[PDB]
Design a protein around this nucleic acid. Structure first.
Ligand SMILES: [Mg+2]
Ligand SMILES: [Mg+2]
Ligand SMILES: [Mg+2]
Ligand SMILES: [Mg+2]
Ligand SMILES: [Mg+2]
Ligand SMILES: [Mg+2]
Ligand SMILES: [Mg+2]
Ligand SMILES: [Mg+2]
Ligand SMILES: [Mg+2]
Ligand SMILES: [Mg+2]
Ligand SMILES: [Mg+2]
Ligand SMILES: [Mg+2]
Ligand SMILES: [Mg+2]
Ligand SMILES: [Mg+2]
Ligand SMILES: [Mg+2]
Ligand SMILES: [Mg+2]
Ligand SMILES: [Mg+2]
Ligand SMILES: [Mg+2]
Ligand SMILES: [Mg+2]
Ligand SMILES: [Mg+2]
Ligand SMILES: [Mg+2]
Ligand SMILES: [Mg+2]
Ligand SMILES: [Mg+2]
Ligand SMILES: [Mg+2]
Ligand SMILES: [Mg+2]
Ligand SMILES: [Mg+2]
Ligand SMILES: [Mg+2]
Ligand SMILES: [Mg+2]
Ligand SMILES: [Mg+2]
Ligand SMILES: [Mg+2]
Ligand SMILES: [Mg+2]
Ligand SMILES: [Mg+2]
Ligand SMILES: [Mg+2]
Ligand SMILES: [Mg+2]
Ligand SMILES: [Mg+2]
Ligand SMILES: [Mg+2]
Ligand SMILES: [Mg+2]
Ligand SMILES: [Mg+2]
Ligand SMILES: [Mg+2]
Ligand SMILES: [Mg+2]
Ligand SMILES: [Mg+2]
Ligand SMILES: [Mg+2]
Ligand SMILES: [Mg+2]
Ligand SMILES: [Mg+2]
Ligand SMILES: [Mg+2]
Ligand SMILES: [Mg+2]
Ligand SMILES: [Mg+2]
Ligand SMILES: [Mg+2]
Ligand SMILES: [Mg+2]
Ligand SMILES: [Mg+2]
Ligand SMILES: [Mg+2]
Ligand SMILES: [Mg+2]
Ligand SMILES: [Mg+2]
Ligand SMILES: [Mg+2]
Ligand SMILES: [Mg+2]
Ligand SMILES: [Mg+2]
Ligand SMILES: [Mg+2]
Ligand SMILES: [Mg+2]
Ligand SMILES: [Mg+2]
Ligand SMILES: [Mg+2]
Ligand SMILES: [Mg+2]
Ligand SMILES: [Mg+2]
Ligand SMILES: [Mg+2]
Ligand SMILES: [Mg+2]
Ligand SMILES: [Mg+2]
Ligand SMILES: [Mg+2]
Ligand SMILES: [Mg+2]
Ligand SMILES: [Mg+2]
Ligand SMILES: [Mg+2]
Ligand SMILES: [Mg+2]
Ligand SMILES: [Mg+2]
Ligand SMILES: [Mg+2]
Ligand SMILES: [Mg+2]
Ligand SMILES: [Mg+2]
Ligand SMILES: [Mg+2]
Ligand SMILES: [Mg+2]
Ligand SMILES: [Mg+2]
Ligand SMILES: [Mg+2]
Ligand SMILES: [Mg+2]
Ligand SMILES: [Mg+2]
Ligand SMILES: [Mg+2]
Ligand SMILES: [Mg+2]
Ligand SMILES: [Zn+2]
Lengths: 206, 208, 60
RNA sequence: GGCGCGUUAACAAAGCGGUAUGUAGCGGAUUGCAAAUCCGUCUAGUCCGGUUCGACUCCGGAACGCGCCUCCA
RNA sequence: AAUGCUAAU
RNA sequence: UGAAACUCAAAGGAAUUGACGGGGGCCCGCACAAGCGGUGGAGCAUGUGGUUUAAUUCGAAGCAACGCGAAGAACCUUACCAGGCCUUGACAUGCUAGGGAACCCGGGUGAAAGCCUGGGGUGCCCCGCGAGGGGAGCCCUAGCACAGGUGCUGCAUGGCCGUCGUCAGCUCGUGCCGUGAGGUGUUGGGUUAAGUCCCGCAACGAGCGCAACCCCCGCCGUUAGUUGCCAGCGGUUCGGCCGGGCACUCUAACGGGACUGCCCGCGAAAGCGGGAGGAAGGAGGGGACGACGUCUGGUCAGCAUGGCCCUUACGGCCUGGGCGACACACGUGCUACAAUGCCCACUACAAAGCGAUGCCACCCGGCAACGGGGAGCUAAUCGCAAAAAGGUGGGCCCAGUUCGGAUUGGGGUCUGCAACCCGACCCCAUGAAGCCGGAAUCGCUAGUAAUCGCGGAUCAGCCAUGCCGCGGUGAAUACG
RNA sequence: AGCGCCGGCCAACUCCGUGCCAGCAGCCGCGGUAAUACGGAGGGCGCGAGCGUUACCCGGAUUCACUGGGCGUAAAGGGC
């Protein structure tokens, strides 16, 4: 065990909570279970839409839910034909009132979860790994980021012996609290096993 | 009961000989003879490699301790004059004795004393010791050949059973019998393997 | 015996003393916190992702 | 055959009519581990019969082992 | 003053 | 002077980067030394080896396994054992067919599961005062696709973690040197906790690490004053109880303050020594934070996952047992061996926490555990809650003791469907070893060690002497 | 219409079976439960009335160096 979670380290300093609500000792765990159910359901719904971040916000028997995706149209659809539907089931999955919002990501290259998901998708396609890591890091650095790092671990290329390949460019100061570092993780389920993909994007210091 | 033991500093045995007493001991232990192969990471291994080692097991039937006696019906005794000094005594006395074991032709001659009786007794004693030594030598040679036929050279090949620890597998190559309870087998649960071996032995006599 | 154990714990027993807590995420039966309903491993995982409201790394 | 001697525990080996030792073995310490070292602990008088309050010990027998003699012809 | 570490990355 | 048979797929030279040395130099760390308190001996608690058992489930193995996974094993947990039971299954989608279920109270046998069972009801869209038939929330029987597996492989893996090591390092771009591996930079001098900084230099710069940015403590200020507090004032049943006030303490947000900032000396400089002021002085004290990599390190039993294996059983249910065994061996602890003590009565002084199938004031009954009434408190309001060491007074008078509290007999309380295997606590009786511990071995540099009590997670109850925290009293020593 | 080969040298790759066994091998080496190296199959490469193997000679071998090598430390300066 070596490194702390980059997001967990900076909670309340640089990063913000994904779920923002108040609950007492009696209601905390049930609302938390509902939040986990909602996030799990939406994760396998908008995968092709580029789901980066899901935010759950509750006032009083009503929950906001704001999703951040690469292609809002993939979530909304023709006249909202899907946007309403994904909402309705959500209510049937929560027994409350929901206000599902869709947000576009200005730069999909600057969102570490999206970079990691893309790299994992390429790895699943039996693509070369080292080239993918180099290309993704170069793409991130081409979008104004002050630094980027991508790490892949597992049976790279189907090999019998697991390895780790990483690439980096610029600055990744993991020990600096004021640094705004976005972290992303993804899994690649290939026929020979599971590979882990990690992405760090440095966007300057606040 | 343990008859002989040569332990090692790490708690192993370079050799250990013991006895199984009971009706049918040899019949039930007769399938354990041969070379046993182990594939595992040694506790003497420093880099964590897998090694392949062997141990040899020899099974023999406990023999009998029949005493040795001379049958005088196959022994010829000659008496004659001795040689050397003594004057008229040695000229005229039949003091020298020869004993001949007729089946083998082995003879022993005694002339040590002036007395025919003592010489005869000494010659018979020496002949008995010689015949007993030959009997023991031939028995030991036969037993040595049996041991060698059982254990051979102990090489990695010619093994009779393999105990794979990483795979938790036991394989008997005589009958192709593989099981996956390695801890149970090593704790003394040899009944399935032995019943399979007895099955094979009974089936091999399917004549005609 | 994992899925059946989870479902059985989710079921009502004949006696009230036969009810025991399990982790609502991975099904663990040991070290399950009442406040969250989660085991220590799942609690650490979810806290590092910012998905536990108000929960932060402690240092004093 | 004559005469003399001996039999002690895991081995080698002593004194004693009333009470070993050395190296081993076993438990612990030290060492990454083994050895070496250190701290503790420990298994008996060939067998039978006597004398004696009391026998490994004194006496008689038996068995086995060892040593010397067995000459005048 | 202090001996040694078989044999399959 | 000088062969061969046979045998090996190399044997060699120089140089490079590492590693290592009972080589050298310069440094460092509770490494030693200087000290204080322990462990190794006793009893007991607990984890492990072994042995035993039907089973005593499984994993963890030098440091870095052994009060470890386990922040709660009577049943459950539970993965093991014995017996009795079930079969598309306790959980998930789909194709059918026969019923059409859907939801609810009763009957035999059984330890229970189970098996055989006896009485009613489906919305919705229909032709519709019709017998009725149709598509539909949903269920069962007989078939399937299948579910399920704590079954094996951490030597196929992800994720997470331990460790070297909070050690001071590990590298890169371009340039230059070398046939090349590679080197330089990064070496030398001074300095630092630090590859920290300064000077010099075929290098000039940069990145990951160091430091800083974040949290707690220590001083002060602004905003506020309830459930907090009570300096001055007036009442008072003598409690801030009231009026009243935010002075003070405190509470919680925002700020300031410390930066070698000033003076003397030393030195090219970085910096080092001394002093003033200041609550705080040279990193102020303590956390969070762990580089490239190493260890075929740990975890398929938290989860996920490749392959292999089982499929009226290696799946699932119940009852009972086991994980609590016991000639022994080891680790971590608790309680002592006493007078700087033990016992008894009265009397002070904290902090951080928890509380609605809850915390429980107070009163009554029992020696007591506790029981019966019964306020207040969803809690800066009410409760847990008594703090203990301490202070005062008395008793014990060197003893196996008014030291010590193991073991056992008996009477009880409570939790739980149920305390036999195998819970905790109260009372009576019993009153073991132990007189400071062999070779040896451990922690700790200041509010530290030592010593005293308090809270919390898990949790019906608890085998907690464990773990994570909190405050009270408060040392000795460091020459080197 | 057949024969050899398909790890590198060297042209031509996947699946199954096995599990330091069976076996392959000119050298280096393969095989110990996921083998492009063993065996079979599908595919491929080279030749083709032939295709391989063994034996022997020259070449590659500047490795007896005339063309065309060396002797400080690699083998090699004789004790003078
Ligand atoms: Mg003559
Ligand atoms: Mg003569
Ligand atoms: Mg004669
Ligand atoms: Mg005569
Ligand atoms: Mg089972
Ligand atoms: Mg419970
Ligand atoms: Mg639980
Ligand atoms: Mg002897
Ligand atoms: Mg004696
Ligand atoms: Mg002795
Ligand atoms: Mg001894
Ligand atoms: Mg010993
Ligand atoms: Mg040693
Ligand atoms: Mg030893
Ligand atoms: Mg020793
Ligand atoms: Mg004479
Ligand atoms: Mg050595
Ligand atoms: Mg050596
Ligand atoms: Mg040796
Ligand atoms: Mg050595
Ligand atoms: Mg070694
Ligand atoms: Mg060696
Ligand atoms: Mg070696
Ligand atoms: Mg030769
Ligand atoms: Mg010391
Ligand atoms: Mg002690
Ligand atoms: Mg002890
Ligand atoms: Mg003790
Ligand atoms: Mg165990
Ligand atoms: Mg396992
Ligand atoms: Mg430890
Ligand atoms: Mg501990
Ligand atoms: Mg416990
Ligand atoms: Mg059960
Ligand atoms: Mg149980
Ligand atoms: Mg590993
Ligand atoms: Mg791992
Ligand atoms: Mg280092
Ligand atoms: Mg360079
Ligand atoms: Mg060059
Ligand atoms: Mg360096
Ligand atoms: Mg260098
Ligand atoms: Mg440091
Ligand atoms: Mg630096
Ligand atoms: Mg830092
Ligand atoms: Mg004020
Ligand atoms: Mg391993
Ligand atoms: Mg293991
Ligand atoms: Mg698994
Ligand atoms: Mg698996
Ligand atoms: Mg246990
Ligand atoms: Mg017990
Ligand atoms: Mg321990
Ligand atoms: Mg102890
Ligand atoms: Mg105690
Ligand atoms: Mg007493
Ligand atoms: Mg009980
Ligand atoms: Mg005593
Ligand atoms: Mg005393
Ligand atoms: Mg010790
Ligand atoms: Mg220190
Ligand atoms: Mg304890
Ligand atoms: Mg090719
Ligand atoms: Mg081959
Ligand atoms: Mg071939
Ligand atoms: Mg294969
Ligand atoms: Mg080939
Ligand atoms: Mg093939
Ligand atoms: Mg030519
Ligand atoms: Mg050539
Ligand atoms: Mg030539
Ligand atoms: Mg040539
Ligand atoms: Mg020439
Ligand atoms: Mg040459
Ligand atoms: Mg030369
Ligand atoms: Mg030369
Ligand atoms: Mg030489
Ligand atoms: Mg040469
Ligand atoms: Mg030479
Ligand atoms: Mg010369
Ligand atoms: Mg010479
Ligand atoms: Mg000369
Ligand atoms: Zn969990």
């Amino acid at each position: 065990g070596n490194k702390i979670h980059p997001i967990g380290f900076r909670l309340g300093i640089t990063r913000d909570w994904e779920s923002r609500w108040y609950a007492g000792k009696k209601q905390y765990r049930h609302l938390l279970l509902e939040d986990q159910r909602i996030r799990g359901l939406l994760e396998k719904e908008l995968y092709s839409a580029g789901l980066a971040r899901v935010d759950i916000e509750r006032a009083a028997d009503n929950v906001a839910v704001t999703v951040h995706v690469a292609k809002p149209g993939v979530v909304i659809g023709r006249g909202g034909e899907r946007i309403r539907v994904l909402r309705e089931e959500l209510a049937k999955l929560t027994g409350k009132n929901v206000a599902l919002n869709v947000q576009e990501v200005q730069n999909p290259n600057l969102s570490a979860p999206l970079v990691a998901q893309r790299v994992a998708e390429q790895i699943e396609r039996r693509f070369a790994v080292r080239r993918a890591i180099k290309q993704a890091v170069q793409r991130v650095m081409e979008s104004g980021a002050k630094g980027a790092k991508v790490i892949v671990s597992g049976r790279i290329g189907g090999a019998e012996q697991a390895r780790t390949e990483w690439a980096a460019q610029g600055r990744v100061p993991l020990h600096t609290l004021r640094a705004n570092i976005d972290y992303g993780f993804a899994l690649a389920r290939t026929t020979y096993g599971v590979l882990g993909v990690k992405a760090y994007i440095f966007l300057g210091e606040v | 009961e343990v008859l002989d033991s040569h332990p090692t500093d790490l708690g192993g045995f370079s050799k250990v000989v013991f006895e199984v007493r009971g009706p049918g001991a040899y019949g039930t232990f007769k399938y354990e003879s041969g070379v046993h192969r182990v594939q595992r990471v040694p506790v003497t291994e420093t880099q964590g490699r897998i090694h392949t080692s062997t141990a040899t097991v020899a099974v023999l039937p406990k023999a009998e301790e029949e005493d040795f006696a001379l049958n005088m019906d196959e022994i010829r005794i000659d008496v004659m004059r001795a040689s050397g000094p003594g004057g008229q005594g040695v000229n005229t006395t039949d003091s020298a004795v020869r004993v001949v074991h007729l089946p083998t032709g082995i003879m022993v001659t005694c002339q040590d004393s002036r007395s025919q009786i003592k010489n005869r007794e000494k010659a018979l004693m020496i002949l008995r010791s010689r015949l007993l030594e030959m009997k023991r030598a031939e028995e030991a040679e036969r037993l040595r050949k049996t041991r060698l036929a059982q254990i051979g050279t102990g090489e990695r090949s010619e093994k009779i059973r393999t105990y794979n620890f990483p795979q938790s597998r036991v394989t008997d190559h005589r009958i192709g019998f593989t099981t996956h309870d390695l801890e149970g087998v090593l704790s003394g649960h040899l009944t399935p393997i032995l019943e399979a071996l007895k099955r094979a032995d009974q089936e091999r006599q399917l004549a005609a | 015996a994992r899925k059946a154990l989870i479902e059985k714990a989710k079921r009502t027993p004949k006696f009230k003393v036969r009810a025991y807590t399990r982790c609502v995420r991975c099904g663990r039966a040991r070290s399950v916190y009442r406040f969250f309903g989660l085991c220590r491993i799942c609690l650490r995982e979810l806290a590092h992702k910012g998905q536990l409201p108000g929960v932060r790394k402690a240092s004093w």
